[PDB]
């Protein structure tokens, strides 16, 4: 049972140390269930972000194989272009040989410059992988390096250690009860149906069902701007001068749980999880961001949700498994 420990950065980001190449060069990567590519900065990159992060050198690796292929990825926050190469990636005690990954050439902007991590390790489906590059978990499975074709995530709260990604296993000590299994609707992101979102037995959004993605790489609970506007009023959040959605800290004690009903099961998120503490004031864990797809407009069940529920991502049966954290 192969475990990758993750560091918690201010309850906003979760990343861990991987080794790429022979001998291994170390990187910090976001373990991200909302994307499917692996990339790190390389010596071919001269953008500001590449000057203050760890840079892969293909010339120091006996196992590096080059391609003539490039990759370009756009995230919610930032952009990279790079070249695809093959090497051994050491992740969670697994030696993932013949792993295609991106070596950055450009990392425009300021987000990637101030971020504590060097790259991203995507854990979603091959269908959303830029340049059809094989994701890490797919290459681990295809080579028969695990027995169970699932990984499970535990994300700690309140800046504590203990977060992990467990490749090729589950560990019962992290959750109370038994796992509830939810079918993936569309195989790209880890996409599921939410039946309704409620507060005190009244639907506040997604009254007749909506599509959501379970994303380790998003900090907050995200949804369409219009439903999010109602939720912000419902919790007494007001916009301030800096642009932030503030709520009275004192008011946590009188707010109801918001309930996410998934596959006929109730998943409550308490006010102490969905209102966050940032600098003596308290802000809303809800963010409006319109993401249109073939299957309507998406909600993101970000880290605010995943902290409350141990999550198992099952590729053999195309299911997400949820249970309350211990």
UniProtKB/Swiss-Prot annotation:
Domain of life from the UniProt record: Eukaryota
Principal location: secreted
Residues recorded as bearing Phosphoserine in the entry: 68
Catalytic site positions: 32, 215
Alphabetized UniProt keyword annotations: Aspartyl protease, Digestion, Disulfide bond, Hydrolase, Phosphoprotein, Protease, Secreted, Signal, Zymogen
GO MF term (any one): aspartic-type endopeptidase activity
GO cellular component term of the entry, any: multivesicular body lumen
Occurrences of domain Peptidase A1 (ranges): 14-323
Subcellular location: Secreted
Record field: catalytic activity: Preferential cleavage: hydrophobic, preferably aromatic, residues in P1 and P1' positions. Cleaves 1-Phe-|-Val-2, 4-Gln-|-His-5, 13-Glu-|-Ala-14, 14-Ala-|-Leu-15, 15-Leu-|-Tyr-16, 16-Tyr-|-Leu-17, 23-Gly-|-Phe-24, 24-Phe-|-Phe-25 and 25-Phe-|-Tyr-26 bonds in the B chain of insulin
Role summary: Shows particularly broad specificity; although bonds involving phenylalanine and leucine are preferred, many others are also cleaved to some extent.
Family, per entry: Belongs to the peptidase A1 family.
Protein name: Pepsin A-4
Shown residues in whole-protein numbering: 63 to 388 of 388
């Amino acid at each position: 049972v192969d475990e990758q420990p993750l560091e918690n950065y201010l309850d906003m980001e979760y990343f861990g140390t991987i080794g790429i190449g022979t001998p291994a060069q170390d990187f910090t990567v976001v373990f991200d269930t909302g994307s499917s590519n692996l990339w790190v900065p390389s010596v071919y990159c001269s953008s500001l972000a590449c000057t203050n992060h760890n840079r892969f050198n293909p010339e120091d690796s006996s196992t590096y194989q080059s391609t003539s292929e490039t990759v370009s990825i756009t995230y919610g926050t930032g952009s990279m272009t790079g070249i695809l190469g093959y090497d051994t990636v050491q992740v969670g005690g697994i030696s993932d040989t013949n792993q295609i990954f991106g070596l950055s050439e450009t990392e425009p902007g300021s987000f990637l410059y101030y971020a504590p991590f060097d790259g991203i390790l995507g854990l979603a489906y091959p269908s959303i992988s830029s340049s059809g590059a094989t994701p890490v978990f797919d290459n681990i499975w295809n080579q028969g390096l695990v027995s169970q074709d699932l990984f499970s995530v535990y994300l700690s709260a309140d800046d504590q250690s203990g977060s992990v990604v467990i490749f090729g296993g589950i560990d019962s000590s992290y959750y109370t009860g038994s796992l509830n299994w939810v079918p993936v609707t569309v195989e790209g992101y880890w996409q599921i149906t939410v039946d309704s979102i409620t507060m005190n037995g009244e639907a506040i959004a997604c009254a007749e069902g909506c599509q959501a993605i379970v994303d380790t790489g998003t900090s907050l609970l995200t949804g369409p701007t219009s439903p999010i506007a109602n939720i912000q009023s419902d919790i007494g959040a007001s916009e301030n001068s800096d642009g932030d959605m503030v709520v009275s800290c004192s008011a946590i004690s009188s707010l109801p749980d918001i309930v996410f009903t998934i596959n006929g099961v109730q998943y409550p998120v308490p006010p102490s999880a969905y209102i966050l503490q940032s600098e003596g004031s308290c802000i809303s864990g809800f963010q409006g961001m319109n993401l249109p797809t073939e299957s309507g407009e998406l909600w993101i069940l970000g880290d605010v949700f995943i902290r409350q529920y141990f999550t198992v991502f099952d590729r053999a049966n195309n299911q997400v498994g949820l249970a309350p954290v211990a």
